[PDB]
Design an enzyme around this catalytic site. Structure first.
Site, PDB file in Angstrom:
ATOM      1  N   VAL A  82      10.941 -32.884 -22.096  1.00  0.00           N
ATOM      2  CA  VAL A  82       9.468 -33.186 -22.678  1.00  0.00           C
ATOM      3  C   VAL A  82       9.910 -31.946 -24.274  1.00  0.00           C
ATOM      4  O   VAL A  82       9.799 -30.368 -23.334  1.00  0.00           O
ATOM      5  CB  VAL A  82       8.898 -33.197 -22.023  1.00  0.00           C
ATOM      6  CG1 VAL A  82       7.090 -32.538 -22.359  1.00  0.00           C
ATOM      7  CG2 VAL A  82       8.589 -33.419 -20.624  1.00  0.00           C
ATOM      8  N   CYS A  83       9.095 -32.156 -24.928  1.00  0.00           N
ATOM      9  CA  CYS A  83       9.394 -30.855 -26.218  1.00  0.00           C
ATOM     10  C   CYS A  83       7.705 -30.238 -25.909  1.00  0.00           C
ATOM     11  O   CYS A  83       6.878 -31.413 -26.690  1.00  0.00           O
ATOM     12  CB  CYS A  83       9.537 -31.149 -27.348  1.00  0.00           C
ATOM     13  SG  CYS A  83      10.434 -29.887 -27.929  1.00  0.00           S
ATOM     14  N   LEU A  84       7.041 -29.679 -25.431  1.00  0.00           N
ATOM     15  CA  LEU A  84       5.283 -28.543 -25.164  1.00  0.00           C
ATOM     16  C   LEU A  84       5.863 -27.615 -25.744  1.00  0.00           C
ATOM     17  O   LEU A  84       6.952 -26.372 -25.045  1.00  0.00           O
ATOM     18  CB  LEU A  84       4.727 -28.723 -23.656  1.00  0.00           C
ATOM     19  CG  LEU A  84       4.169 -29.301 -23.738  1.00  0.00           C
ATOM     20  CD1 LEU A  84       3.190 -30.399 -25.189  1.00  0.00           C
ATOM     21  CD2 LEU A  84       3.247 -29.885 -22.724  1.00  0.00           C
ATOM     22  N   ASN A  93       6.420 -37.308 -28.641  1.00  0.00           N
ATOM     23  CA  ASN A  93       7.775 -35.659 -28.413  1.00  0.00           C
ATOM     24  C   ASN A  93       8.675 -35.544 -26.961  1.00  0.00           C
ATOM     25  O   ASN A  93       9.062 -34.583 -26.459  1.00  0.00           O
ATOM     26  CB  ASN A  93       6.484 -34.914 -28.120  1.00  0.00           C
ATOM     27  CG  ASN A  93       6.199 -34.802 -29.514  1.00  0.00           C
ATOM     28  OD1 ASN A  93       4.494 -35.102 -29.447  1.00  0.00           O
ATOM     29  ND2 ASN A  93       6.064 -34.196 -30.477  1.00  0.00           N
ATOM     30  N   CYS A 112       6.177 -31.085 -29.539  1.00  0.00           N
ATOM     31  CA  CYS A 112       7.595 -30.202 -30.349  1.00  0.00           C
ATOM     32  C   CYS A 112       8.719 -31.380 -31.056  1.00  0.00           C
ATOM     33  O   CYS A 112       8.884 -32.453 -30.316  1.00  0.00           O
ATOM     34  CB  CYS A 112       8.156 -28.932 -29.842  1.00  0.00           C
ATOM     35  SG  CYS A 112       7.677 -28.538 -28.686  1.00  0.00           S
TER      36      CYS A 112
END
Lengths: 153, 6, 4
Positions: free
Chosen positions: A88-90, A81, B6
């Site tokens: 960072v993809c959160l 991710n 994501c």
């Protein structure tokens, strides 16, 4: 943003999670750049990430905390991710998605630590780490351990 | 804390 | 895979 960021810097200095680092950089005029912090997240104990100290930058916009910071591992991290750029993809890091102004830097850093050993394979951000996780979890864990040794403090 | 990559 |  400056009052909230100074409040969180003050709070960080008085108390923060062990092994974590969060420090504002300097502006061209010498003042503290509260909008750009050099951070570090230790790999969680009992996980293949343990031993590594993963450096990342938190970039805050003028309207923080209405907007999330942009979090970027420097250098780029191998994680399903984390985009190839290192971003960072959160979901909490997207304004239109799950960002809430009540969320703090301490919660973001603790959450990114949790993300390290809890990737979401439904929506991966990088082809490299995800492909390895999907085909061979043994090779995936070895790539994670090798990276933790590469980023050991 | 709705945390999910994501 | 999604793009940034």
């Amino acid at each position: 943003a400056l009052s909230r960021l100074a409040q969180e810097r003050k709070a960080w200095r008085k108390d923060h999670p062990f092994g974590f680092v969060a420090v504002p950089t300097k502006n061209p005029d010498g003042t503290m750049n509260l909008m750009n912090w050099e951070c570090a997240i230790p790999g969680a104990a009992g996980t293949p990430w343990a031993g590594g100290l993963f450096k990342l930058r938190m970039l805050f916009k003028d309207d923080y905390p209405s907007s999330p910071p942009k979090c970027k591992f420097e250098p780029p991290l191998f994680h399903p991710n984390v985009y190839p750029s290192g971003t960072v993809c959160l979901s909490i890091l997207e304004e239109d998605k799950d960002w809430r102004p009540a969320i703090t830097i301490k919660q973001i850093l603790l959450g990114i630590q949790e993300l390290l050993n809890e990737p979401n394979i439904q929506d991966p951000a990088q082809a490299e780490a995800y492909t390895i996780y999907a085909q061979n979890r043994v090779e995936y864990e070895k790539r994670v351990r090798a990276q933790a040794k590469k980023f050991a403090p | 804390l709705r945390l999910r990559g994501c | 895979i999604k793009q940034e």
